[PDB]
Every structure is written in structure tokens, then in C-alpha cells.
Amino acid sequence: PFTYSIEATRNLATTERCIQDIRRSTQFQLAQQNMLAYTFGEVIPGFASAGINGMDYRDVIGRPVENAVTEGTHFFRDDFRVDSNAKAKVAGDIFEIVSSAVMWNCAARWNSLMVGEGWRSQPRYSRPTLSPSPRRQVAVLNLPRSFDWVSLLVPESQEVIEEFRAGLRKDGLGLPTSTPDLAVVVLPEEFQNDEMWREEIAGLTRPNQILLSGAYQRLQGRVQPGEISLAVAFKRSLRSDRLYQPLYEANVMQLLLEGKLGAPKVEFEVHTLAPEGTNAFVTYEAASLYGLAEGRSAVHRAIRELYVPPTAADLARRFFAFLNERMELVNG
Amino acid sequence: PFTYSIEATRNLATTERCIQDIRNAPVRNRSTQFQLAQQNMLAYTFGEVIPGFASAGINGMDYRDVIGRPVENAVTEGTHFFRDDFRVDSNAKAKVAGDIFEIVSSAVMWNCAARWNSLMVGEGWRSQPRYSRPTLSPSPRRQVAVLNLPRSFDWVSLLVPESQEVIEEFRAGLRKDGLGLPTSTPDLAVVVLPEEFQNDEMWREEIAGLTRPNQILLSGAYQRLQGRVQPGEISLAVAFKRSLRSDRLYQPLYEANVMQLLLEGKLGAPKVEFEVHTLAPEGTNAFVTYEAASLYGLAEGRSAVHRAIRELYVPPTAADLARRFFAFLNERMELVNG
DNA sequence: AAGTCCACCGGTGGACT
DNA sequence: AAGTCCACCGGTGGACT
Ligand SMILES: [Ca+2]
Ligand SMILES: [Ca+2]
Ligand SMILES: [Ca+2]
Ligand SMILES: [Ca+2]
Ligand SMILES: [Ca+2]
Ligand SMILES: [Ca+2]
């Protein structure tokens, strides 16, 4: 009608409406795997030029989205547009994938020394002092979406845990396990002469991406409860509500690995580039609840540290020093 | 030059640039252009309506639609006044939709508590709308307070000082070892009404709408109760999450665990009831996650281990939300002597 | 008072069917 | 393949200063 009317409008057939609709809604996809291959095809931060190794880690992790934005602008001009939720999702995966690659190369360089091939000198990092041994080799495992960390355990340990859950599921309870982003594990005895674990990679090409992202498959059902040496959760920035998955999961890991399988203190740390204030530091001082609730065990922190890598080299240095220390707990 | 050059462009004086910014845009930390004024939206949309205590049409409507109505009205106003210029980020809608889900639902529970309290002090059972009359023996010591808790809150501050000292002395022990056990907060706490307030009419009045004074009454209520609740008088804790993601399940799971360690473990309280409300579970993932046993209960090793989170609840309508809460009170408040 | 903190969640790329 | 599931985080309104 001349004066607008909701009733009249609601009564029109679809094809009689004044506006005809002729249209996920995403327009330009951030191809994150392509982005890694492009920006980090030939660079693993902390193992490249002193410039990249020493650079503000936030700038490094941010480079691929920046390069992708520049690419998009070139090809699509003033039509180019991506949602902040895209950038957010990709930036996070990139933070995780890249740091896990730094750690992979530290692991390779450390394995190469454990096995008696000496200590690679480029770039220069202080030579670990621990006495070398094939049995002190480690694997860095970037764990996939949907993983259950329990699947790393030798089958006998899964049974122990499974039985324990049975008792619970019978009464409507359970104790699901999810997953940290990453786990470093002592390399299984059977793999200790395999060459692959000692080779540093040149960059995140697609083949190398697959290598790092699928390495967990090779160790599934092979790790002793005590041989899970470090768990890491990466969160590129924090918010107060986003802190708890790693805190909770570390608690569950300590309960099962320390409590039910008698393993040493489980080391679980969080990495972020933007703690956005200081409360997360207080939050992650929380004592491990299992250790508290029962009396037999010395109580320690669920999360050992909230770490803010300044540079890629500092991340590399910190892992090395951790290995140099944590691996002493393993007979050579 | 004919072929675009980044350096030539850099060298351009600002008055020589090809694009001339003429916005006169005030430079700020944030790039927001229109704010969703959430307290204003609550007032406009629910000024005269508390869902579950309004019209048959509202009480029985899909609760997703009720909760989504303030943002929808807001978008209407916005496109009316600002036409093509009106844009807000999905992140603004997420923030405001979240707070609205929690504030609205907490207001439904406030009205329930009032109607409940009215019955408990012997003033009978209201009928508009119609809810099943409670079978539990009325008593003024079975009144409850619904507390929408503030951002930054620490739930331990509700507890009577005698109980807070136990906790602090426990934490002091932990600190000598370089440990802590911080506590955060659930969105909402239902607590037994302290004696001193059991004759206060303000706990028996139902509110007509979320006008700004009512918003403030509800959101400020916790202050009145700070330091006056016994450990075992914390009857229900609720976290509201309008939708779920697998990574966003854990604050309430963790906090419920901490509440149970301290309240049940250290203060002898009975099972701590703690539940999540969502309108969008996105699968069965979270229902499995929340079957998790209370970690405290386990590790120590006594019988009758229970879940940390009692239930993941998905409110079909506001009416159902009220019914459930009434049903809960009816069963839970029998643990309290008349 | 501009700035900082707090806690809100929805749109995303890739794995999987 | 057409769809669902997973787990990523940054922009936000209001409190507090
Ligand atoms: Ca991963
Ligand atoms: Ca899974
Ligand atoms: Ca992560
Ligand atoms: Ca609140
Ligand atoms: Ca606080
Ligand atoms: Ca909430």
C-alpha cells in the first residue's frame, strides 16, 4: 500500500516482494598452509639469519597474515576484505605451527648431539652440558585437532586408564581427556637409530608441514607414562575466560599420569605473545588439584610457567635449557 | 609514474596524494563506529517484559528468539537512523548477545526466587503465569537469593568471615611452597537467604521489567550478601554460555572443581551444584565433556564421587527455565531445616 | 577523563566423512 | 562432495579510574 504495512508485506508471495534476493558467506579465504609455505618456505625462525632469529617474535608470527593481506590487495584491490575472525583463527594456528617447528629443529639438533654427531654451530647456541646418550633423544609432537593424548600411551597404560574410567562410566561419570597443542616425548627405544629425528628442516614447505603435523601418528601407542616430558599450550593472546582449557587439562594429565600411572611431575607450560595484563600470571599459579586432594604426594603447580617468547632465538634457547635439565632424569 | 611505484608514493607530500582522506575521523584506540548500548537495549526490549512472567506468547516462544530480540531491535533502529552507514562487528553482537543471555536468564530466576520466597514466608503461591505449586513445607529459612555476580568477582567473598579465614590459612600454607589456589566466579549464585534478611520484602517482589533501576537492583544485589553466606548455603551456581565451542567449555568446569575442593573438601559442605546453560551446544561434544567427575572427589578416594557439572541445560523456552528452577528449589531446599 | 581491565562469543581453514 | 566438527582468538560495553 502507499503507507508501508508489515501485514501487507508478510502476505506477498515470494515473487511479489519489492526486494528480490539474488545472492558460508566468506569471500576470500586465508589459505594458511599456503601462507606458511610462502612466508616460511625457507626460514625457520631461530635457525635462520640473525635478523629473523633476533626479531620481535610478534612480528615474525604476524608476517604471514601481513604477506597474505598484501597479496590479496594486489589481486583484488578495493574488493579485498577478510573478517577479523579469519585473521584470528589463522594467526593462532600460525603461532602454534611455527613455534612447534622451532621446537622440532631444537629437537633435531639435540638428538644429533645425543647420538654423538657433535653440536651444530649455525646459528650459535650454547652446547648442552648433559652427557650425551641415544636414550635421551626426544620427539616434538604437534598434536592434531580432535586428538586424545592418552592415545600416545603404550597399550598397557591405556588399559590402566580405561579400567579406571569403566568404574566411573558405570555411575554416569567419566573423565574424558582432550589434548595439549604439543607434547615432547622421550623417543621410544625402537626408534633411537632412525635418521629422521635428527634432521632439521629448512622451512615450512607443504611436505615439511605434513611431516611435523603427522609425526604423532608414528608414536601413538608407544610412549611410557613417564616419557611425556613436556606439554605446551599455545595461545597467541589471552583473555581471562580463555585460560582454562590448559589449566584443566594439565590437572587431568597429572591425575592420570602422576596419580594412576606413578609418573614424575608432569611439566605443562603455556606460551603467549600477549598476556593482556597480568592476571593470567596469578591464575596459572594454581596448585595441581590431584596432588592437593590426596596426601601422599608433594604438591606442585598444574602449569609450570606462563612464557612470553620475546624472540624465536629465546624460545629456542629456553627449550634447549629445559632439555638439558629434564633429560637428566633419564638414564643414558 | 605510469607503473605504480611504492617509493614515488611514499615521497608524495600529503597534498599531492591521489587519495585524499576527508573523513576527519577522530583517531582512537578502537575503530568502533556505532556502539550497541546494551543496558539501553535491555530497557527498550524488556522494559515491560520478563520472559516466563509475561504473555503466553513470550513465555512459550523459542528462547533463542527471545534472547535474540534486543540485538534485532537494535539493528532495526540502527538501519533506520544510519541507513547505509550502519555497521557493527560480529564481535560486538557476540559480546552483547552473551551479556543479554545471562542478564535476562538471571532475571527470570530472580522472579522465580521472589515467587518462591513469597510462598516460603506464608504469602501463598502466585498464579500469573501458572506454575506448579511447590510441595515443600513453607518456611522463611528456605528463602533464597539469586545473585547475578559482577565481572571481576571472587565468589569466596560471599562467605562468612569465619569461612574465609579457613581458606586464607589454607592458601597461606600453599604460598610457603610457591603455590596458590585462586578462585574466580560463576555467572550466578543462588544462596540461602541469611537470617537477618528473611523478613525483608525486597526478596519477595517480582520485577516488571529490565528498566535501568531494575537492572541495577539485580546486578547490585550481591553486595548486600557479601560475607554473610555459610559454605553449605551456596545452593546453585550457574554459568551461562549462549553458544559453545570445544575450547570455551573449561572455565566453569575448572571453577566448579575449585568450588568443590574448597567448599566440600575444606568446609565440609554437601555436594556443590553447578550447571551450564546454553542455547547452542553444537553437537554432543559438550554433553560428554561435562560428565567429568569432580577431580577432588576422585584423587582423595571416598565413595559417592559426583560430576563437577551436574547438567548442561538447553532452555527451550523461558517457561521451561522457570519450571526447572522451581523443580530444583523444591528438591534442593529440603536439605534446609524449616 | 582517556585508559585499562574484564569476560562476552561467532566466523573462520582444514580434517573428515 | 556438501556438510559437520574442531579449536583458533580479537573487538567488544560497561566498570572503574
Ligand atoms: Ca596442532
Ligand atoms: Ca576426538
Ligand atoms: Ca592452542
Ligand atoms: Ca554478571
Ligand atoms: Ca578480581
Ligand atoms: Ca558466562
Author numbering:
A (entry chain A): 2 to 24, 31 to 339
B (entry chain B): 2 to 339
From the paper:
A new crystal structure of the type II restriction endonuclease SgrAI bound to DNA and Ca2+ is now presented, which shows the close association of two DNA bound SgrAI dimers. The new structure of SgrAI described here shows a tetramer that is unlike the NgoMIV and Cfr10I structures, with the tetrameric interface of SgrAI at the DNA binding face of the dimer (i.e. head-to-head) stabilized by the swapping of the amino-terminal 24 residues of each subunit (space filling spheres). The domain swapping, along with other contacts between the two dimers, create a tetramer of SgrAI bound to two DNA duplexes. The crystallographic asymmetric unit contains two such tetramers. The crystals were grown in a solution containing 50 mM CaCl2, and two Ca2+ are bound in each active site at positions found previously. The contacts to the recognition sequence, CACCGGTG, by SgrAI are identical to those described previously. In both tetramers, composed of A, B, G, and H in tetramer 1 and E, F, C, and D in tetramer 2, the hinge loops are better ordered in one swapped pair than the other. The symmetry within each tetramer shows a small deviation from perfect 222 symmetry, where a total of three 2-fold axes occur orthogonal to one another. Analysis of the active sites of all SgrAI structures solved to date (Dunten et al. 2008 and current work) shows very similar placement of all groups including the DNA in the various crystal structures, indicating that only a single conformation of the enzyme has been determined, which we have argued to be the low activity conformation.
SgrAI is a type IIF restriction endonuclease that cuts an unusually long recognition sequence and exhibits allosteric self-modulation of cleavage activity and sequence specificity. Previous studies have shown that DNA bound dimers of SgrAI oligomerize into an activated form with higher DNA cleavage rates, although previously determined crystal structures of SgrAI bound to DNA show only the DNA bound dimer. Type II restriction endonucleases typically bind and recognize palindromic sequences as dimers, but the unusual biochemical properties exhibited by SgrAI suggest the formation of a higher order oligomer, containing altered enzymatic properties. A mechanism involving domain swapping is proposed to explain the unusual allosteric properties of SgrAI via association of the domain swapped tetramer of SgrAI bound to DNA into higher order oligomers.
